[PDB]
Design a protein around this ligand. Structure first.
Ligand code: HEM
Length: 397
C-alpha cells in the first residue's frame, strides 16, 4: 500500500529516518495523504531543485490533484485562494509587488530597529524573571514585533493589541471569537492603510499604499488580503526557528560555545541551523502540469507532488556529513526557504531576525537553561511547519 506521507519525526533536530531510504531507494515515492488521496514525494536535493525550478509544475490549488493535507483544504479553488497558491501572471503579480519591501538593503536598515525591539523584549522578560515559555515569551515576541516594524504598525500604541490577535486568530479556541479577532486585526490594518495614504512613512504598507493602491493597481480589499497573508507566512515559522534553534543550542553546549568563541560565525550559523532543522519541509506542494521526469521515475501529469526540503537539506550528494551541524560548512546551498518562483520573500528578514534574536539571547541571557525536564518537551503534532509548542526556561536572578 502507498505509505502515508506525513511522518512524525523522531528526532526534532533532523529529518525523519525514512528519508534516507527515500533518497537512496525511492527518489520519487508515492504516498497517501491524510485525506487518503495519493501524491508523489521528492527527497533528493538535486531533484527538489529541478522539480521546484521546472516550469512544468504548478502551485494552483484549483487542480484536483493538489496535495492538500487537509479535508477542505483543496476546496480553496472553489473559493478564492491566496496568491501563494497560484501560478501564472497572478502569482507574480502579488509576489513581485512586495519584493522591493523585502530587499537586503531594506532589511540591512532595520537591523538597528530590529535589535532594539529584541532588546526590549529581553528587558521585560528579563526583569520579570521566573520560569517562562520561550516559545511564547521570546520566539513569538520577536516574530510578531519584527513584523510590526516591517508592516508599519505602531509599537506602543499597538503591538499588545496585535500580539494577542494573531495568537487568538490562529488556535483552537473561541470558534466564534476568531471573527472578533480577525476583525480587530483587519480593522487595525485598515486604519494604517488609510492613514499612510496621507503622509506615509517607510513601511511595507506605505510602499504598497503609495505605489500600488494609490495608482489603482490594487483594490483596498486586495492590499488587505496580501498584508494578512504575509503575516501568516512569517509568524508561525519564524518563531518556530528561534524556539527550535534554541533547543539545539541548549541540547549541545559545544555549539553555543563556538558562537561565543567566534561571534563572527553567527551569520553562518543561522544558515546551517536553517538547513539542519529544515522547519518547512512539506510546505511546498505542487502539481505537475505535464509529466516531469526526475531521477529514475516520472510523475504523471496533473498529479500532486511534494518537495521535501528536509530530505533535500540533508542529502549527502550535496552536503558532506549532512548530519553534523558544522558552523564552518564550506557549501551551504540549502533550500530551507524553498527554490524557484515561490521561494521565500522573507528570507532576508528571517535571517536578520534569527541572527539578532539568537545572538542577543546568548549574550544577554547566558545563564539561560532549560527549566522543564528534557524528554518532557512537546513538539507540535498539528502544524504545517514542524516546531516546538512549549519550551520552559529559566535563568539566574
Ligand atoms: C522560519 C523562516 C522561514 C522559512 C523556513 C520560510 C520558508 C518558506 C518556504 C519554504 C516558502 C515556499 C512555500 C511554497 O512552496 O509555496 C515560503 C514562502 C513565503 N514566505 Fe517564507 N519562510 C520563513 C520566513 C518568512 C518571513 C519572516 C516572511 C515575511 C513575513 C516570509 C514570507 C514568505 C512569503 C510572502 C512567501 C510566499 C512567496 C511566493 O510564493 O511568492 N517567510 N517561505
Amino acid at each position: 500500500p502507498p505509505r502515508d506521507f506525513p511522518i512524525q519525526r523522531g528526532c526534532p533536530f533532523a529529518a525523519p529516518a525514512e528519508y534516507a531510504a527515500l533518497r537512496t531507494d525511492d527518489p520519487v515515492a508515492r504516498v497517501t495523504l491524510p485525506t487518503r488521496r495519493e501524491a508523489w514525494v521528492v527527497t533528493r536535493y538535486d531533484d527538489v531543485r529541478e522539480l521546484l525550478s521546472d516550469p512544468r509544475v504548478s502551485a494552483d490549488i484549483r487542480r484536483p490533484g493538489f496535495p492538500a493535507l487537509g479535508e477542505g483544504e483543496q476546496e480553496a479553488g472553489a473559493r478564492f485562494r491566496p496568491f501563494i497558491r497560484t501560478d501564472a501572471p497572478e502569482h507574480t503579480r502579488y509576489r513581485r509587488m512586495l519584493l522591493p519591501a523585502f530587499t537586503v538593503r531594506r532589511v540591512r536598515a532595520m537591523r538597528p530597529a530590529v535589535q532594539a525591539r529584541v532588546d526590549e523584549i529581553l528587558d521585560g522578560m528579563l526583569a520579570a524573571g521566573g520560569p517562562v515559555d520561550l516559545v511564547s515569551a521570546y520566539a513569538n515576541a520577536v516574530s510578531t514585533s519584527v513584523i510590526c516594524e516591517l508592516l508599519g504598525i505602531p509599537r506602543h500604541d499597538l503591538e499588545f493589541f496585535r500580539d494577542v490577535t494573531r495568537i487568538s486568530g490562529s488556535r483552537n479556541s473561541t470558534a466564534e471569537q476568531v471573527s472578533e479577532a480577525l476583525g480587530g486585526l483587519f480593522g487595525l490594518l485598515g486604519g494604517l492603510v488609510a492613514e499612510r495614504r496621507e503622509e506615509p512613512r517607510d513601511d511595507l504598507i506605505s510602499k504598497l499604499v503609495t505605489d500600488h493602491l494609490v495608482p489603482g493597481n490594487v483594490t483596498t480589499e486586495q492590499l488587505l488580503s496580501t498584508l494578512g497573508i504575509t503575516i501568516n507566512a512569517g509568524r508561525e515559522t519564524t518563531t518556530s526557528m528561534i524556539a527550535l534553534s534554541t533547543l539545539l543550542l541548549l541540547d549541545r553546549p559545544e555549539l553555543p560555545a563556538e558562537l561565543r568563541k567566534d561571534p563572527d560565525l553567527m551569520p553562518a550559523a543561522v544558515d546551517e541551523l536553517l538547513r539542519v532543522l529544515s522547519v518547512a519541509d512539506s510546505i511546498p506542494l505542487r502539481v505537475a502540469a505535464e509529466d516531469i521526469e526526475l531521477s529514475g521515475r516520472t510523475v504523471p501529469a496533473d498529479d500532486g507532488v511534494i518537495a521535501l526540503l528536509a530530505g533535500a537539506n540533508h542529502d549527502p550528494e550535496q552536503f558532506d556529513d549532512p548530519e553534523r551541524v558544522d558552523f564552518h560548512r564550506t557549501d551551504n546551498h540549502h533550500v530551507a526557504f524553498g527554490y524557484g518562483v515561490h521561494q521565500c520573500v522573507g528570507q532576508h528578514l528571517a535571517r536578520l531576525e534569527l541572527e539578532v534574536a539568537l545572538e542577543t539571547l546568548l549574550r544577554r541571557v547566558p545563564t539561560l537553561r532549560l527549566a522543564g525536564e528534557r524528554d518532557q518537551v512537546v513538539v507540535k503534532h498539528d502544524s504545517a511547519t514542524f516546531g516546538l509548542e512549549e519550551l520552559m526556561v529559566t535563568w539566574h536572578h
